[PDB]
Subunit: 451 residues, 2 copies
Amino acid sequence: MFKKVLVANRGEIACRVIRACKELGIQTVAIYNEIESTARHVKMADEAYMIGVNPLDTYLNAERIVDLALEVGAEAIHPGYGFLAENEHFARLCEEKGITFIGPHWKVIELMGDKARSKEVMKRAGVPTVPGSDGILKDVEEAKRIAKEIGYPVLLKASAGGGGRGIRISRNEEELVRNYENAYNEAVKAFGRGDLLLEKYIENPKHIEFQVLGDKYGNVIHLGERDCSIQRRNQKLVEIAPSLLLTPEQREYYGSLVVKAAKEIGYYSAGTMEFIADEKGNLYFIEMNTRIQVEHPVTEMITGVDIVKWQIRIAAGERLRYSQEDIRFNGYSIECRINAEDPKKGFAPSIGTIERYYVPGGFGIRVEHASSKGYEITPYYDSLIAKLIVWAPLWEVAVDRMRSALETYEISGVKTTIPLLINIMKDKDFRDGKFTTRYLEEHPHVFDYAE
Amino acid sequence: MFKKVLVANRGEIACRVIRACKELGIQTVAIYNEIESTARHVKMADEAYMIGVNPLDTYLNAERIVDLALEVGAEAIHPGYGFLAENEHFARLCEEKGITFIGPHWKVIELMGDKARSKEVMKRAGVPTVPGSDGILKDVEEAKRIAKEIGYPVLLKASAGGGGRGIRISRNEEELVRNYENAYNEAVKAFGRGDLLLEKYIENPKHIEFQVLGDKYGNVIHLGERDCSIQRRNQKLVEIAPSLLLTPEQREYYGSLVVKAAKEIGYYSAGTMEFIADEKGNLYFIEMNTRIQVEHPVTEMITGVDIVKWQIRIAAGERLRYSQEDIRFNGYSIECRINAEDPKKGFAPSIGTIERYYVPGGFGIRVEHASSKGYEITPYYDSLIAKLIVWAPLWEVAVDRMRSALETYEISGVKTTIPLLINIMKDKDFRDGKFTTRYLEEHPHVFDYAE
């Protein structure tokens, strides 16, 4: 086990990692910017250093961070999420200097950082990807047969031009033929090549992601899935585990496939495969996050596995003790992101300082946060104040516990998402389990709350 | 299910009950004093009424509380712990005016409020008790005779007792006779009844208590035991569940016995049977609490049974769904009481106001509290700020999780028990599981800490 770990992050994730380290008996090193001389993660760590020439350079200068790790005797670095966590050069640099990066191998970070390569990698492992043409369509005849085979509606886009000319949606073969001719000609006019690409169109989809965890000996398990469909500006707001969509058969089916693909790429540490999902539970891979995710706690509540602590154990060379049949999914868990932002003004960040601050607690309630009275929301960093997490044996009780926790969470000095999240918990469709990635668009009544 | 419930208490137990009620969809009513116009429990409640001519009249004037319940349409009253929770006159009055008292029947409260009768109830059920007098002593001669028969050292206890007053240890018959008048006089002073009991004095005992829960149709179960040995002057500081003393076989044996006694008296709601254990680990009943206890959360962590919510359901006439073989004991839970008191100055209350306040959170951490920056520790009410509760699969990780949570719980403006609790968590005897009611006397180094 490591004697000392440097946490190359801030805020709630820095505190989550520090707590795991403290429980393991590991000495911690925090880094911060001088604008945050008072941060919670700075007070929780055993030692803390201000580095960086501006608030973001503090966490994004890989060379400075690795030299500090060397200077203070840190044997490993946890990158948290965001910043450098999926930066292959940071991880390679750690390894090149003899510091363990707590995460997958830098070669894997690099491979799965490119969206297309990662889809190809997954296609070859057996994980479903969104069907479409294999590259450029030969001609409209091939377009008609591929579309018929994958099912309408389908999407057409030019291969050239980075989307300077847009997408066309076709609901039948007549529309496909017309759209093909028109997209071809627009692309000739705009980019001098008519070549087009086609893919199945997943309308009104859900966001479902699978969690994996592997040690350095090839033992890889999954920990089920999370439904993160309720989001704004591709920004997740509410996350649940397990999904209400999948059956246990479907969960183990898709789960063992992501386990196979991870085993084939030599994945270890924690990672997530994000999918889009239809009404019937068909899933299509879209991307892999090669790091811990913000919403990892809902998976921890239903499986009882401490993911962050396992990351550290795995990076130090321990075996993942469990096997896939030791993993059980017990109850339902919901996470709500309490952000300092104003949902009635475009989720603009509410910059300022926390005045009243009461954190709820109780049976089945978990809080991840780095906030107190006087915590300052700056424009330089993300607007997350806290993650409110709930567990219950039944879906409806989880909803009620979450509603009740939110209704007692007092934060003043800044606008937050809490009133919105309360309205979601009270909404019949959400309670019914009926929501997609367009939920917010489709339920504007949840923005109706009083000053 | 009740539509509305009045919570006849304050502070963290009131918030605990309000949360159970909110989750069940019940409207809540808080009561409070003018010195607490901003208390947490009043902000959490759907309605709140200022009553009382002083800080205690608010919660002890049974007549005022029941009338207000009627004025406002509360169908039921939850008494919390302390104040009137074990006041049979309060409970009777609720019943005579048509308000459901959330707790056992008032005749049971009265029956079990007398230490002699409670001990006879337990003897008649087969529950082991401490050898001693056959109920209340007629006079000092019966005491000198019975003491001879059971062997010194012996103990005198007030039967109407509660706490340390009216109790004396006698190492010989010389000491016993002076102590008989001294204890009798102290018992009259403190409780208005001098009735004394004699039993045999167990030096260095552990404090082990069993939790029961029964519905109004006679289904009664136990939820295992708690070791609350680490205490001072009849104030528990650290409570664990399950004990490390008992095997699974002993836990189901003593548990089924207290279930038997409870059924024999028609017990329903929640209650606790307190035991002392001797040097050889044998258990002896000493008293019963006819109410929710402060440390109930640790039992909820290891069984998953929400005791306060089941109290409310039972009071409304629900059947207790579980049977005894449904109840499992999973892992270990530790609760620490975070009090505004100075352990270096005799645990004198630290009167003042909270300035800095950061509540820790994470995997396996639960916090019960009613405090924020500016919460006032007054001389009128107990000094509890928060209960910190942790769960872990293994005893050593529970200890590490609690130590690590305590090391991050920041409170300024008053002295607290936190530095003392951290030392206890680092102490080898505690980590090894060797602690008795004399732990603190026997471990003075845990009182050596900075500031």
